[PDB]
Amino acid sequence: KLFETSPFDPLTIKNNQDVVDKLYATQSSSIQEVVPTKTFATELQFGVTS
Amino acid sequence: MDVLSKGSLKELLAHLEKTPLEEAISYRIGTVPYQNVLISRNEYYNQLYPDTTSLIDGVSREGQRNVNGLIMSIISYVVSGSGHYIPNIGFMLLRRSILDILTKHDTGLVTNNLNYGIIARNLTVSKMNCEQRKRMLICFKLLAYKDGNQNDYEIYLNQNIPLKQIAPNFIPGDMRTVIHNQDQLAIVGIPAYRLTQSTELSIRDDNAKSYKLGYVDWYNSNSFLRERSEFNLIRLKDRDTKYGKLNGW
Amino acid sequence: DVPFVQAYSKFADDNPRHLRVKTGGKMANALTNVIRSYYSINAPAIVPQV
Amino acid sequence: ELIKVPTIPHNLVLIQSDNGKHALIKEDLGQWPVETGISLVNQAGVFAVQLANKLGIDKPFVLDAGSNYFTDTSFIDTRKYCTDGLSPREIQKALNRQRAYYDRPELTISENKTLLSQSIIYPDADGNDVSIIFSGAMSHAIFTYAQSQWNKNIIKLDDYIREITLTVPKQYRPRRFKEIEHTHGYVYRELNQGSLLPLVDANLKESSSYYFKKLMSSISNVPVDHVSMLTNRLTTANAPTVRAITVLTCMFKQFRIGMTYALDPNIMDVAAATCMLLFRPAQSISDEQYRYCLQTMAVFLTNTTYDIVNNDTIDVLKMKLRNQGWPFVERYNAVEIDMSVEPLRSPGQVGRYYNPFNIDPLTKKHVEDRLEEFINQVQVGRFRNASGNAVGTTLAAFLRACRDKTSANWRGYSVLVSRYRSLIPNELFESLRNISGEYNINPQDEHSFFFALAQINADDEFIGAIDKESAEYLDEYATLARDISNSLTLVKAAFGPLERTSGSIINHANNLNKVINHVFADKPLISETMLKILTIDGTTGKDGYRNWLDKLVGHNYPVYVEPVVNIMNFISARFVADSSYFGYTNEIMIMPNHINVPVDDRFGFRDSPFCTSLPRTIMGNDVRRISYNVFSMMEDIDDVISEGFILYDAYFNFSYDIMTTDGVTRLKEDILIVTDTGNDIKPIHFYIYFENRNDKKLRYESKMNVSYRLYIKTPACLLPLSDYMRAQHDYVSPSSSRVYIKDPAVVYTRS
Amino acid sequence: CMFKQFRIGMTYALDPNIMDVAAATCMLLFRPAQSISDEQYRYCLQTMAVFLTNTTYDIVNNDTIDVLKMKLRNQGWPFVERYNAVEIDMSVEPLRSPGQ
């Protein structure tokens, strides 16, 4: 068996965004070179709205 | 190897500003050029393969002790990866950058009398490839704008139509032109095709292949800078910024 | 004037304005300099490929 | 977050007569009332937002219309047939009925195929899908312009990373994006930074007090791990407060601090004064405080009085102290350390901060190279008495304890200053000042702070707390910048300059209150963050905003024009330029029925009230033109109306409904109403019918029953069915391969 | 060990403790030098210098590897070098397939 848990089931994906969302969901099964945590933001701007 | 990996006008010009002139010259005596030689290529033939030595090979060769020889060594370093043997130039000139030698009057070198016909003939241009010719035309353009010989540069290009077709389009004093340029000037890089560990018959091709296989080893070594992984570890001075521009441009 | 406003905006990349000469924009400049280059080999090639 | 619009708004309706002879296409953008006597552009802006909301272009968006297609049954045809816009089947039916009236052959199969294939979707070189549909002109122009404005802030992820690569420190773990994000990732971000200077300069005391108090509350939570008079006064009760002052002095530029001494100085006051001059930045000590400290030392050591040295200059005071044997008469500049990364909200700038305790980072010692020699001088000095050396020995021992404490703890405090410095931008570093002296140091607290200096412990809780503060500060600065931009636009549009006249002052005050009452109703325009800044002095937030707005009138501050402002300016301009699209006109004509005026015969209406242009001359003579104000005031309107005239200088709102049957075209109400006060025009509503050209009854009714007619310019929304190719318009939808990243952060929060 | 293109790196606190220095020395001593980047090598030297020479990260930010090595050696720290790993030749027996 190539994978104990498949990265994504291809029949359930409809477009590119579907692949990335599934890859983020099944990333715990993989050996991550970086383990995610809270993100740090160094830039933020708010634009005027209608 | 580092110079041959530059793929854009921005990267190539940035590298020339950082590197000094001593990298362009070599302290190994080498041999003399324009000599018919018999070399050994045993993977293909049992006899000795004839070839002719030139200034474009990646091996150091003895060079003339004049301004003409100095410019030929600089262009050879850019288009081949190794320079020539011109010693006792002086520490004042050897400390300055390659770009400063090419496009600044403060260095003290006088290059007005240089003729592009013999320089192209000596730095054999019928044996260069498209990427090598583009780099040489960059050096000619930088020199021409240094001594105010833009008109002579244009006439030389108009005489040789193929050179005009591939001539890079940038003004040596303007940084916007360097940013907009999209020429591909890389002689070594990660190959899409299958690169094997085999010899080539010609001296130029064998040396070029050695640089290509050497770049692959360097690309996968620890000296390479992977921006996607360690962009926060580079210092702020050498970090990539769009506001960054060449000095005096 | 809506049809002309849309056509000029596409051609010139700026909206037409009163009290302005209505030159033609960047496309007009590129076309003019490209014509010069084709006629003679002594004419400069100044328009970037980008 | 980007909004993904599925369908294109076309706003097209087909109206055809029962006979089938006449058909037309109309844009229905609604009716918008316009009031005369006030500015038209000001009303247009209000209607611009409503129109943008109706079309769905108010918020940032992209168009997803590349999947709205089908495929024909023919094997040769591999084209995509768009389902958006007015359906080509509806036009086919309308054309189909028109031919039935004229006894003409029906539309052929080849002619049907050409018409039904007019709406298509095809891809371009860049991968985008362009849809060609039947839609109105005004809707297409506004929708396409909005797309151009929003797409300016949609950039590749690698382009976003290059912009912010100089703000990322080295203590945070890099984030690994997926391979799809790196090739096809896009983000919607606004990259223009607004200055906080307009608010800071106008209210320096309030802005400084707000940020200083916020920082101290955070710093005060950092974890840490003659002789009789000096040794009886040590207290560590206010050490956290003194610690925060120390970090503030080094993290800011010109954060002046002050100390007040007693009426009769003692050995403790001299110790505090020496510690202030030796271990605090010279940039944080003013000249007057320097003179006060020298005077305090002179009073005690030389046994003089404050009156004697009240008129003494700095150079004289130094000479007196040096003669007695006191060498500590100098203040020392701190050594500035450059930040490792570009500070926040300071593009292309280098941040710096002072090193605490005047320790040179290169030598890791005090900046004064004579410190050890000076302490020996104090130890062998005869102060305040003939002999005994009690004061000198006590001060020498106290000074040595401070020197060792500062040398051991300088690294810990330098790290604390550096981390808190990254919170504030460069503008706040150079602008904020300590006004009113709302932070001061007691002389006992100063000498207790340096004698009992505590090491700085950076636990995981402290690091996590600071990271939360960094996110809060970033949001706070972004919110403040937006409200500054909103305030600057409001002042420029609604206020003018003042004059030394009662009328101008009264006019300004009334307008100021009207604006303030409007901007605080419902959801306030201004955020709670700046209301806190303006309230910090105790005044009401509403009053504080009124004061700040008045100061801002006549400013020359540059304001960046954002995409939403560009969109509304476009809609406002087309509102004024093309009035017929929105149901109002600036000119009407009233004529008797027996006067034959040329009208628009394209649509086949019976006695059409629409003219291509209001005629310049009728029967060889120019048509009279009367303004509405003069017309309202006229008393001989009966004589004038007998010849017919043109009414202008007003905004006339009109409505009409096209009836498919045939009848007498007329108005709902009478044209005018005459009162003892003035004459007015009643609301205009046209009942328009199609004409059969051979009905004697309706010909007689129109000529004899109706005696006066009202004419307006032909509305541009109408378009004859024969010209249906004029509604063919293009729309570009970006490629479906793109992925939009909600969180574009490049690093994680872990050491 | 199996794949040469793979790399190892660690991120330290702004104020390193003795644990960070121990982690840095263990990585330098025991992980292959071919798997530690030049940027990572400088970062480890910076962390060692911050703890041992009593300096902050901003002071030693614009310091080369030669300067950091000299600073650490003057204090008495000899672990400033990367150590290459020996290569072990491995063979997979053929059995029913060509060997590797």
Side-chain angles (χ1 to χ4, degrees):
Chain A
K1 286 173 61 37
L2 299 161
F3 319 111
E4 76 178 12
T5 278
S6 267
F8 68 117
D9 196 22
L11 301 184
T12 60
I13 287 77
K14 226 158 298 303
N15 74 91
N16 261 348
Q17 191 84 69
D18 289 345
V19 180
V20 296
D21 295 349
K22 179 87 173 171
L23 277 194
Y24 275 121
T26 60
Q27 66 178 359
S28 324
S29 97
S30 93
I31 296 204
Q32 305 145 110
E33 266 317 299
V34 86
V35 169
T37 188
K38 194 144 315 300
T39 38
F40 193 70
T42 75
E43 183 280 335
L44 185 63
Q45 317 290 350
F46 293 160
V48 297
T49 74
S50 319
Chain B
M1 176 189 309
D2 61 356
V3 54
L4 299 179
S5 33
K6 301 317 180 213
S8 32
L9 214 46
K10 198 189 178 161
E11 296 164 17
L12 179 62
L13 284 194
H15 172 81
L16 288 185
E17 158 145 4
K18 157 179 21 164
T19 184
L21 187 62
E22 255 210 324
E23 297 315 288
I25 85 190
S26 295
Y27 292 129
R28 293 178 179 83
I29 186 167
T31 38
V32 299
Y34 320 123
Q35 192 207 357
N36 283 289
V37 291
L38 284 167
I39 66 198
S40 155
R41 289 276 130 81
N42 219 233
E43 150 174 351
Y44 301 109
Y45 302 114
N46 276 319
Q47 33 162 329
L48 299 143
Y49 187 84
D51 211 53
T52 325
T53 57
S54 64
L55 292 182
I56 283 321
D57 326 304
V59 200
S60 159
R61 300 277 201 268
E62 252 170 312
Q64 307 187 303
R65 333 280 271 251
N66 41 10
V67 171
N68 217 331
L70 191 43
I71 292 312
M72 293 204 258
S73 167
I74 286 158
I75 306 179
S76 293
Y77 167 71
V78 175
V79 315
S80 178
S82 148
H84 306 330
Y85 179 59
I86 309 126
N88 289 61
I89 294 185
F91 80 98
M92 294 300 293
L93 231 47
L94 291 182
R95 290 293 195 160
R96 319 228 41 199
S97 93
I98 299 191
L99 206 55
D100 302 13
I101 300 281
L102 285 162
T103 179
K104 260 195 185 26
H105 271 296
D106 184 1
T107 69
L109 206 75
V110 182
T111 46
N112 305 284
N113 58 289
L114 278 206
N115 192 349
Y116 305 144
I118 318 86
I119 293 185
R121 245 180 65 255
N122 298 350
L123 283 199
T124 52
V125 81
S126 55
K127 308 183 137 23
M128 302 201 177
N129 49 68
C130 183
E131 280 81 13
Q132 290 184 318
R133 284 153 164 161
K134 283 197 249 267
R135 298 185 167 226
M136 188 196 53
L137 292 189
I138 288 149
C139 295
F140 284 176
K141 191 157 206 173
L142 281 157
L143 272 159
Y145 280 72
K146 174 213 164 143
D147 322 87
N149 276 105
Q150 303 108 332
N151 178 71
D152 289 345
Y153 179 73
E154 292 323 298
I155 297 297
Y156 165 73
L157 279 190
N158 290 359
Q159 292 316 291
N160 315 116
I161 299 319
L163 289 188
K164 170 104 141 142
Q165 270 165 281
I166 62 97
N169 171 229
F170 82 108
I171 274 74
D174 186 322
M175 210 36 186
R176 284 119 77 224
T177 85
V178 189
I179 286 312
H180 291 159
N181 197 259
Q182 30 174 92
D183 283 3
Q184 309 270 31
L185 312 152
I187 320 192
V188 298
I190 286 313
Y193 57 96
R194 163 199 324 180
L195 199 52
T196 36
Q197 300 248 354
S198 72
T199 326
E200 302 247 346
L201 301 134
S202 173
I203 303 171
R204 291 188 342 281
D205 282 33
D206 200 22
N207 300 339
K209 183 126 163 223
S210 313
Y211 279 106
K212 268 181 262 265
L213 296 167
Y215 184 69
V216 173
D217 279 1
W218 184 73
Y219 187 96
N220 305 316
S221 96
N222 48 47
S223 317
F224 187 69
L225 216 171
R226 310 200 187 148
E227 285 272 339
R228 282 172 183 192
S229 295
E230 46 208 51
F231 63 96
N232 49 18
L233 294 187
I234 318 170
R235 333 191 208 228
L236 210 55
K237 334 173 309 174
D238 289 345
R239 293 195 183 174
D240 289 345
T241 39
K242 183 180 68 65
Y243 295 93
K245 64 179 180 180
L246 264 39
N247 269 323
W249 287 44
Chain C
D1 283 42
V2 175
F4 176 73
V5 156
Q6 258 272 312
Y8 185 79
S9 95
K10 198 166 202 1
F11 194 84
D13 307 68
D14 40 289
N15 261 324
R17 263 178 95 191
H18 304 289
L19 312 170
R20 297 294 181 145
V21 175
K22 261 183 272 280
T23 47
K26 308 202 133 307
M27 176 114 72
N29 266 119
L31 196 56
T32 296
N33 296 323
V34 151
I35 285 161
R36 280 164 161 132
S37 178
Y38 286 144
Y39 192 58
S40 175
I41 210 184
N42 320 123
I46 43 155
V47 203
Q49 183 81 36
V50 49
Chain D
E1 200 252 350
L2 262 183
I3 279 158
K4 259 176 178 257
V5 184
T7 55
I8 321 177
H10 55 106
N11 318 103
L12 270 203
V13 277
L14 205 139
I15 296 125
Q16 197 170 21
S17 52
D18 295 356
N19 238 355
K21 189 168 155 94
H22 298 112
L24 52 89
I25 321 173
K26 182 200 180 1
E27 226 186 27
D28 184 1
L29 287 168
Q31 295 295 119
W32 311 92
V34 176
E35 214 257 329
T36 315
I38 51 169
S39 295
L40 179 58
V41 175
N42 287 358
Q43 319 174 61
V46 190
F47 291 143
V49 190
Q50 300 178 235
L51 246 176
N53 276 50
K54 204 175 99 93
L55 279 148
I57 57 135
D58 38 349
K59 289 141 149 14
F61 75 96
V62 281
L63 199 67
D64 289 345
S67 295
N68 297 6
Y69 69 96
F70 60 92
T71 286
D72 191 69
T73 326
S74 153
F75 36 88
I76 294 295
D77 213 299
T78 76
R79 261 176 321 187
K80 304 167 169 327
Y81 288 50
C82 195
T83 72
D84 280 313
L86 194 81
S87 170
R89 271 269 178 219
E90 296 180 81
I91 312 193
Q92 184 229 359
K93 284 176 220 317
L95 289 171
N96 267 358
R97 300 184 47 202
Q98 203 152 99
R99 272 148 184 261
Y101 168 87
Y102 282 107
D103 219 341
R104 298 178 53 198
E106 249 320 287
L107 274 175
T108 82
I109 312 196
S110 64
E111 282 167 359
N112 264 317
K113 279 178 161 333
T114 280
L115 171 55
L116 296 183
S117 75
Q118 287 308 304
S119 284
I120 48 141
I121 305 186
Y122 60 90
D124 61 356
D126 324 316
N128 309 343
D129 319 314
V130 175
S131 295
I132 317 275
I133 66 154
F134 289 121
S135 96
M138 194 90 276
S139 295
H140 178 232
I142 296 179
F143 202 80
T144 313
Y145 187 82
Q147 288 199 271
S148 325
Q149 296 306 303
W150 292 131
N151 286 346
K152 296 221 303 314
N153 294 357
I154 298 188
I155 55 171
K156 288 165 109 23
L157 173 76
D158 306 276
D159 274 8
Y160 177 68
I161 292 172
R162 262 191 336 120
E163 281 258 327
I164 68 140
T165 185
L166 299 170
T167 77
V168 189
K170 67 152 70 77
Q171 324 108 51
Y172 298 101
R173 305 176 310 144
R175 164 161 176 208
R176 308 280 194 258
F177 287 97
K178 257 79 185 163
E179 301 297 280
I180 296 167
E181 274 131 357
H182 267 301
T183 299
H184 302 109
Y186 280 75
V187 295
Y188 177 82
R189 316 273 298 177
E190 168 71 71
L191 293 182
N192 169 255
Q193 318 216 117
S195 203
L196 316 157
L197 295 174
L199 179 75
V200 160
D201 291 358
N203 289 284
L204 200 41
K205 194 202 31 168
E206 290 82 333
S207 303
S208 299
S209 185
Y210 173 79
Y211 282 116
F212 288 162
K213 164 172 23 169
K214 267 198 52 189
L215 280 157
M216 269 208 33
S217 325
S218 174
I219 300 163
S220 305
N221 284 313
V222 61
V224 291
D225 71 84
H226 264 144
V227 50
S228 153
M229 294 154 244
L230 259 184
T231 54
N232 282 340
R233 297 316 135 194
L234 305 318
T235 40
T236 73
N238 289 337
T241 312
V242 186
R243 203 146 38 220
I245 276 149
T246 305
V247 188
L248 266 155
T249 47
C250 274
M251 67 174 282
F252 274 103
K253 166 167 126 42
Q254 186 157 355
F255 177 77
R256 298 292 180 85
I257 205 48
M259 183 176 282
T260 166
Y261 311 110
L263 274 88
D264 181 65
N266 58 18
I267 200 142
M268 155 165 91
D269 288 73
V270 172
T274 319
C275 289
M276 185 165 252
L277 287 195
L278 230 45
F279 302 129
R280 296 232 188 261
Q283 301 90 352
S284 90
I285 286 133
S286 89
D287 289 345
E288 301 92 16
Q289 183 52 54
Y290 186 29
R291 238 184 86 243
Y292 188 33
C293 289
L294 287 163
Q295 284 171 15
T296 310
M297 302 177 311
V299 161
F300 185 71
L301 300 179
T302 306
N303 219 31
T304 183
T305 52
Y306 263 115
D307 326 303
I308 289 168
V309 290
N310 192 31
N311 64 34
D312 259 6
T313 59
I314 279 170
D315 290 349
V316 173
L317 274 160
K318 280 146 75 106
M319 183 176 282
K320 285 163 130 200
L321 274 149
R322 273 168 173 151
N323 288 5
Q324 191 77 12
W326 191 256
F328 295 119
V329 284
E330 279 160 76
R331 68 194 190 199
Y332 308 89
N333 272 305
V335 201
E336 294 176 286
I337 311 200
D338 288 13
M339 284 174 52
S340 298
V341 297
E342 164 190 323
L344 56 84
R345 290 203 84 99
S346 67
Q349 293 213 255
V350 197
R352 74 203 47 269
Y353 61 97
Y354 308 136
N355 196 61
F357 306 139
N358 297 350
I359 286 271
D360 193 283
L362 265 62
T363 88
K364 289 157 199 0
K365 301 193 324 332
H366 199 271
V367 293
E368 170 90 272
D369 289 345
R370 291 177 299 181
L371 195 56
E372 295 85 357
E373 143 182 1
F374 280 176
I375 297 183
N376 298 354
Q377 266 185 38
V378 173
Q379 199 184 7
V380 298
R382 293 182 183 174
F383 309 112
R384 185 163 179 83
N385 45 72
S387 197
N389 289 337
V391 173
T393 313
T394 303
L395 276 179
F398 193 98
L399 259 159
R400 276 188 251 262
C402 299
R403 183 208 49 199
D404 289 345
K405 299 296 183 181
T406 53
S407 295
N409 301 4
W410 82 264
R411 181 186 64 83
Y413 281 81
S414 200
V415 175
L416 193 66
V417 171
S418 95
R419 179 57 182 111
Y420 273 96
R421 161 74 177 101
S422 322
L423 290 180
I424 66 158
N426 265 33
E427 37 191 2
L428 288 207
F429 172 79
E430 301 229 88
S431 70
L432 293 198
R433 301 293 189 254
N434 191 10
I435 283 136
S436 71
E438 66 145 63
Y439 296 104
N440 261 349
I441 279 176
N442 289 284
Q444 64 180 20
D445 284 331
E446 174 107 6
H447 96 291
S448 313
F449 176 67
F450 283 109
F451 198 73
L453 212 36
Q455 222 90 3
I456 294 271
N457 215 37
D459 289 345
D460 194 48
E461 294 85 284
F462 192 69
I463 300 333
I466 286 269
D467 267 11
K468 293 179 179 179
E469 277 135 26
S470 148
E472 183 178 2
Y473 271 76
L474 250 196
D475 183 333
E476 167 171 292
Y477 292 141
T479 322
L480 272 164
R482 192 211 327 185
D483 320 332
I484 290 160
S485 85
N486 286 327
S487 311
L488 289 177
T489 46
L490 171 67
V491 175
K492 190 147 154 29
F495 298 122
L498 224 37
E499 231 173 330
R500 282 196 193 139
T501 320
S502 157
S504 43
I505 303 189
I506 289 160
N507 190 257
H508 186 72
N510 295 333
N511 292 5
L512 199 57
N513 297 11
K514 290 235 147 31
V515 158
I516 285 312
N517 289 47
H518 190 86
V519 307
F520 276 93
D522 301 35
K523 40 226 302 190
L525 171 94
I526 273 297
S527 80
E528 294 264 70
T529 307
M530 176 178 73
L531 279 200
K532 275 204 313 301
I533 300 197
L534 305 168
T535 295
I536 186 167
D537 264 12
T539 179
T540 304
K542 168 185 290 263
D543 292 12
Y545 195 56
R546 176 164 38 227
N547 301 7
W548 185 52
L549 295 174
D550 194 31
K551 285 190 253 217
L552 273 182
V553 183
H555 68 92
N556 306 316
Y557 293 120
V559 180
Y560 171 70
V561 192
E562 309 219 358
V564 79
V565 172
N566 276 312
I567 292 166
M568 312 288 150
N569 280 344
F570 193 64
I571 305 173
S572 303
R574 311 257 59 84
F575 190 89
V576 175
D578 322 277
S579 60
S580 315
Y581 274 98
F582 307 108
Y584 76 104
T585 185
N586 59 331
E587 200 146 24
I588 64 163
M589 166 153 94
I590 296 120
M591 287 272 145
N593 212 6
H594 70 89
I595 273 280
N596 172 98
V597 296
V599 286
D600 213 354
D601 325 298
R602 287 181 301 154
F603 309 96
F605 295 148
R606 167 177 296 271
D607 294 328
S608 153
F610 303 141
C611 308
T612 67
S613 296
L614 277 206
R616 339 188 308 284
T617 89
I618 273 183
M619 283 282 160
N621 192 31
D622 315 83
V623 186
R624 209 192 155 156
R625 294 183 181 236
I626 316 186
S627 64
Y628 197 81
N629 280 346
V630 180
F631 155 83
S632 296
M633 266 302 249
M634 248 173 203
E635 268 275 327
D636 54 342
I637 191 58
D638 44 23
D639 312 313
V640 186
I641 216 155
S642 63
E643 259 325 293
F645 52 81
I646 283 177
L647 262 178
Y648 78 109
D649 211 270
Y651 291 112
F652 305 90
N653 303 279
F654 63 96
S655 178
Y656 62 94
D657 46 17
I658 297 153
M659 317 270 257
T660 75
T661 73
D662 184 6
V664 176
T665 294
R666 56 175 202 293
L667 280 162
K668 203 172 120 181
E669 317 214 36
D670 325 290
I671 289 154
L672 62 99
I673 166 179
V674 181
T675 87
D676 39 316
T677 293
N679 328 305
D680 283 336
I681 291 280
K682 316 202 76 138
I684 297 162
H685 195 109
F686 287 112
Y687 293 113
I688 309 178
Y689 298 89
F690 301 98
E691 143 164 26
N692 286 342
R693 185 182 295 276
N694 274 338
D695 197 274
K696 208 161 105 149
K697 157 150 138 65
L698 288 160
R699 163 163 108 246
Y700 275 43
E701 262 166 302
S702 55
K703 293 179 179 179
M704 292 177 72
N705 285 10
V706 175
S707 60
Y708 280 71
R709 298 201 155 289
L710 196 148
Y711 299 97
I712 64 146
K713 183 169 71 172
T714 312
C717 55
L718 306 185
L719 166 78
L721 180 70
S722 53
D723 317 350
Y724 58 88
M725 278 306 144
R726 293 219 215 121
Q728 181 136 274
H729 292 131
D730 62 38
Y731 297 89
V732 190
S733 153
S735 98
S736 295
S737 64
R738 319 177 128 181
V739 279
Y740 298 102
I741 306 132
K742 306 184 185 221
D743 189 4
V746 292
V747 277
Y748 291 121
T749 82
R750 182 57 57 85
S751 306
Chain E
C1 293
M2 275 194 308
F3 303 102
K4 322 146 56 54
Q5 70 285 0
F6 273 30
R7 288 203 190 161
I8 285 182
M10 329 178 318
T11 295
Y12 315 95
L14 200 62
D15 184 1
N17 38 359
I18 196 134
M19 159 100 64
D20 291 355
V21 184
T25 320
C26 287
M27 197 216 327
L28 272 205
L29 267 178
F30 303 139
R31 315 308 273 220
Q34 296 97 339
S35 83
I36 296 160
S37 177
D38 290 16
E39 291 330 300
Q40 190 64 46
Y41 181 39
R42 205 174 56 99
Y43 191 23
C44 293
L45 287 199
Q46 276 178 348
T47 303
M48 280 160 177
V50 155
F51 185 80
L52 307 169
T53 82
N54 208 44
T55 185
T56 72
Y57 265 119
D58 306 329
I59 302 186
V60 300
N61 177 45
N62 285 345
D63 276 338
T64 51
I65 309 204
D66 291 357
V67 178
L68 291 160
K69 280 208 274 242
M70 198 151 289
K71 276 202 249 250
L72 288 160
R73 276 172 178 151
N74 291 344
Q75 200 83 13
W77 188 259
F79 300 123
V80 296
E81 293 273 312
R82 273 180 321 196
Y83 296 109
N84 282 342
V86 298
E87 293 172 349
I88 305 306
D89 323 319
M90 180 212 328
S91 64
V92 183
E93 289 329 287
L95 260 203
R96 294 228 63 70
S97 177
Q100 335 181 29

